[PDB]
Amino acid sequence: IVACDDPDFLTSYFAHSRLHHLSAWKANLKDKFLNENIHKYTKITDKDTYIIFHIDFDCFFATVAYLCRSSSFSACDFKRDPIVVCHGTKNSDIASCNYVARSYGIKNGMWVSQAEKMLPNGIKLISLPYTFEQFQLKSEAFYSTLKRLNIFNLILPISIDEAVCVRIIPDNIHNTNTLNARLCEEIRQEIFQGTNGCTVSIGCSDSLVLARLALKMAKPNGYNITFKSNLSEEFWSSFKLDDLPGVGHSTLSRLESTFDSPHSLNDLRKRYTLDALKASVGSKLGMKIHLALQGQDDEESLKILYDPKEVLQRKSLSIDINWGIRFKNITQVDLFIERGCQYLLEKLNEINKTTSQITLKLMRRCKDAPIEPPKYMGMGRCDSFSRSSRLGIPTNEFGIIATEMKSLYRTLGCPPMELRGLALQFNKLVDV
DNA sequence: GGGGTGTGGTAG
DNA sequence: ATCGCTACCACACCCC
Ligand SMILES: Nc1ccn([C@H]2C[C@H](O)[C@@H](COP(=O)(O)OP(=O)(O)OP(=O)(O)O)O2)c(=O)n1
Ligand SMILES: *[C@@H]1c2c(cc3ccc4cccc5ccc2c3c45)[C@@H](O)[C@H](O)[C@@H]1O
Ligand SMILES: [Mg+2]
Ligand SMILES: [Mg+2]
Ligand SMILES: [Mg+2]
Ligand SMILES: [Mg+2]
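ok -> C-alpha cells follow
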C-alpha cells in the first residue's frame, strides 16, 4: 500500500486510476490528431454536405478484459454471464459491464455491492481486473483501421474507444442508405477482425446529435442510420432524457421538475416550448436541447467540424487527486503539493508552454460527514474551496509555482486532517 | 461594453 | 479494501 505521503503515491494512483487513463488517453489522442493532420487541411465548411458515422466499442473495458482474461476465468462466458471490470469486491466502481449485466439494470459507475444485489438467486457477478495496456492496444487497432479505410475526410477522437468520422458528399455524387449501410458493415467487420473479436456500434446521420442518438439505439453490436428526414415518434420514444449530449443527472432533475417528469424524449418533445426550456436549464443548454429535438446541432458543437485544430488545442492543464487523501499535518500537505507541481511542470514543458495563472482547489469533509466514508479511501461528502493567482510574468519555474500553490492552500483555511482532495491547475497557457 | 473570480455540470 | 480524472463550458457575481 502506497500512502498519500509516500513519494510514489501519484505514480501508483495514476497507474491504477481508470479516470486518469480516460483523460490522459483523450489528451494524447487530441495531440496525435494535431500532429497527424498538420498537412491535412480537411476541415468542414457550412457549404459542405456531410454524413457522420459515430463509432464506439460496446462495453469496452469488459469486452477487452474478457478477451484477454487469465485461465482461471476460461469457462466464463461473455454472452451468458454478467461480467464487470473493477478493482475491488464491495464499494468499488464498475468501470464497464457487459450487456448481460445490463439486462438486470446494472450500469457503469454502480458499485459492485449495489450490482450484486440486482442479480437473482443462482446468478453470480463475474469481476475481471483492468487490463490497461490491452485497452490501449485495441484502441490503436481501432484508430489504425479507421485511417486505413481511406474513406473519411475527418476522424475526430472522442475517447480511447470512440470516434466521430465525417464523410463529405460532393453535390454531383448521389449517396444512398445502401452505401451507408455497406460502409457500417465494412467498418464493423474490419474492427472486429483487427481487434481480434471486439465489437463496435455505429450511428450514422446528417447531424452530430442524431449520429450520437443513432449510436445508442444501435447498441450492442449494431448500426443505425437515422437522418433528420427519418425522425419519428418511435425513434424519440426510445431515449431517456439524459441520453441527450450535455444532459446529465442535474439537468435531468431540472427537466423532470419543469415538465412533469417526461419518461422519454418523445414526452419532452410533445410538452416543451423553447421559452420554458431556457427557463428550466438556461439559455444555452435550453437552445441546445431544442435544436437536439429537431435533430440539429448547436453552434458550439459544430466548431469541432469547422475548426478541429483550434478546438482540440489545449487551453489549461491540471491534476486532480480526490482519493487516498489522508494527511496528518501541513508539512506533508506541502510535500504533496510540491510533488504535484513537479509532475505538472514536466507536462507543461513537454507542450512547450508557460502558465500565467494557477488555481488550487480542495475538497474538505462536510461538517456532518463520517471521518471515513463507505468507499475505502474515498473523499466522501465534501465542500469544495478554490483560490487562484495571476503570475506577473508567464513562467514554468518550480520555485514560483510551488511556493504560490502552497500559499494558496494556506489561504483556504482547511485543517490537514479534514482535507479529502486537492486539484492543482494551470488555467492560462502561453507559448514558448 | 471592457476587465475580473469562484462554483458546478458534463463527458468518456 | 480501492485507486472519485480532468478539459472546458456555462453561469452568477464583482469592478471600471
Ligand atoms: N462511468 C464510467 C464510464 C466509462 N468508463 C470507461 C470504461 C468504459 O468501457 C469506457 C468507455 O465508456 P463508454 O461510456 O462507451 O462505456 P462502454 O464502452 O463501457 O459501454 P457502451 O456499450 O455503453 O458504450 O470508459 C468508466 O471507467 N467509468
Ligand atoms: C461517486 C459519486 C456518485 C454520485 C454523485 C452524484 C453527484 C455528484 C456531484 C458532485 C461530485 C460528485 C462526486 C462523486 C459522486 C457524485 C458526485 C456515485 O455514482 C458513486 O458513489 C460514485 O462512486
Ligand atoms: Mg459508449
Ligand atoms: Mg463504448
Ligand atoms: Mg466511449
Ligand atoms: Mg447525457
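Residues 192 and 418 of chain A are 49 Å apart (CA to CA).
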